[PDB]
């Protein structure tokens, strides 16, 4: 009885690895080129009916919280936003001494001081001539420098860029695909809580289309759960960690900006044009969002039931509005039709639940100069959009934070807060992981090489 090693190539074995993933995008958007911030024109087309093939008898451990392909997706969006703004106007001559007065074009009692009508001097096509021009700015984008003289909010720190009026912030799905020699394993387990073995796992050519939606509280337009509402958290007992909630049935939110805004062109200088806001046609009204009271209440009823599993059958669950802080975390921030909304969600998160037709109108505010989440420094300026904006979206989950309280309280209070944008896509990449294929396994057999 003698035994010798044998070499087998093309052997199925893998190991968790770190690598660079490239993009694949559907060709449905190839026609009507335009331009996107995510630049899917260079993104290679995907293969129709990709090889989604099941793997039997295989147990694989996942961990969405230390997962790769989320840190490097974070960088991709940051870098993809940078090269979009590089070739666009630099509004360095825009902030000077303005002379603003309130807008009184039949305004409503809600929109009292929220709009300012400003006039300023700007260079003509010739550098030897100035001329007076005017534009409408929101109250959140100006400060007094006393009087009735103002300046733009964010040019004593940095300078803003004008998003070229062709780039389209509208997200489109993106498939993250691994190179040859690497594979992506997708967890098909229904009751997957983000950690531990996934007895139902498969390997796919690459991920489903993931639309990158930047949003705080109430992450939108995402993937829905399968049969129940899933509460996933890195550590439940730690109050400092967020709680990512994903519920199966979506609840519709209708957000509109009723004002019939108009767009005006102001010449910064030779070859430079600034897109301003001309006189508003019609009436003035606060922007708002709408959700059903019935649909929202039943969804919260499902979330509370699931929250009792990790917190106790006999426990009081309480919802309260945001704690307080920066405007981009105390409100539902999102982008709708090229404009940036900041919605007051106090009407959604206010309830108490004991263990034993109409809609919700939540008001919103608008900004033109935004401090970009990509960096603490550079901002950007969103040009006004012609007409009236209206977008319908799915709320597919929540981002919650539990208030810290002493033991024996018997009342757990949760607050909404989005903050980190890594959570927005960690809710979409919880299924996936990357491994490297490792052929050339050596085993013994009853065979000897010929001499």
């Amino acid at each position, epitope marked *: 009885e003698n035994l010798w090693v044998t070499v087998y190539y093309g052997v199925p074995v893998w190991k968790d690895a770190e690598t660079t993933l490239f993009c694949a995008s559907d060709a449905k958007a190839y026609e009507t080129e335009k331009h996107n911030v995510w630049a899917t024109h260079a993104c290679v087309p995907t293969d129709p009916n990709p090889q989604e093939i099941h793997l039997e008898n295989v147990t694989e451990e996942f961990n969405m919280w230390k997962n790769n392909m989320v840190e490097q997706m974070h960088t991709d969006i940051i870098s993809l936003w940078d090269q979009s703004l590089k070739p666009c106007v630099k509004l360095t001559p825009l902030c000077v001494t303005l002379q603003c007065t309130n807008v009184t074009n039949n305004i409503t009692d809600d929109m009292r001081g929220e709009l300012k009508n400003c006039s300023f001097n700007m260079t003509t096509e010739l550098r030897d001539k100035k001329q007076k021009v005017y534009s409408l700015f929101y109250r959140l984008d100006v400060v007094q420098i006393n009087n009735k003289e103002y300046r733009l909010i964010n040019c004593n*720190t940095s300078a803003c860029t004008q998003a070229c009026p062709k780039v389209s912030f509208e997200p489109i799905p993106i498939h993250y695909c691994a190179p040859a020699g690497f594979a992506i394993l997708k967890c098909k387990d229904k009751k997957f809580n983000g950690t531990g073995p996934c007895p139902s796992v498969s390997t796919v050519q690459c991920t489903h289309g993931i639309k990158p939606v930047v949003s705080t509280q109430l992450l939108l337009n995402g993937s829905l759960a399968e049969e129940e509402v899933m509460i996933r958290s890195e550590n439940i007992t730690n*109050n*400092a960690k*967020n709680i990512l909630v994903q519920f199966n049935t979506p609840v519709q939110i209708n957000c509109t900006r009723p004002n019939n805004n108009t767009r005006k062109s102001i010449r910064i200088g030779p070859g430079q044009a600034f897109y301003a806001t001309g006189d508003i046609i019609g009436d003035i009204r606060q922007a708002h969002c709408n959700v059903s009271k019935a649909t929202w209440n039943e969804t919260l009823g499902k979330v509370v039931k699931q929250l009792r599993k990790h917190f106790g059958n006999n426990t009081i669950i309480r919802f309260a509005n945001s*704690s*307080g*802080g*920066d405007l*981009e*975390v105390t409100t539902h921030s999102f982008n709708c039709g090229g404009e940036f909304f900041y919605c007051n969600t106090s009407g959604l998160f206010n309830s108490t639940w004991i263990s034993n037709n109409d809609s919700i109108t939540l008001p919103c505010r608008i900004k033109q100069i935004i*401090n970009m*989440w990509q*960096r*603490i*420094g550079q*901002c950007m300026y969103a040009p006004p959009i012609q007409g009236v904006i209206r977008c319908v979206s799915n709320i597919t989950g929540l981002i919650l*934070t*539990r*208030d*810290g309280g002493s033991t024996n309280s018997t009342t757990e209070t949760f*607050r909404p*807060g989005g*903050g*980190d*944008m890594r959570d927005n896509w960690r809710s979409e990449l919880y299924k996936y992981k990357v491994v490297k294929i490792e052929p050339l396994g050596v085993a013994p057999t009853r065979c000897k090489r010929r001499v």
Partner: nanobody
Amino acid sequence: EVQLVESGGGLVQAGGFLELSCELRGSIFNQYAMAWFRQAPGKEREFVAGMGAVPHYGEFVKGRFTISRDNAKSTVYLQMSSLEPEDTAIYFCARSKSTYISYNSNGYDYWGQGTQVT
């Protein structure tokens, strides 16, 4: 490895002046916001001041304290002025999970060792 190192060490009397410093080592400075928290003896953590792209101050500040960040040295500096006796507490430095500043302690994942200012 992310770590925060504090300074200041306040031993000044009433109506004093200090400058607490907090250096961020194992992470990008222009990716997160940093805020100062305070713990009087026998009490809970409270928000003092923080700044990412915009500064925020606590209610008890009343415009006495002032925060600033020098991205060159990756530090956040907290000016202290008109220190009343009730400021005696342990001033902590924390890094936010994002670029935005909250008033609750759930918005920060890394904390400083602490500085007892009396």
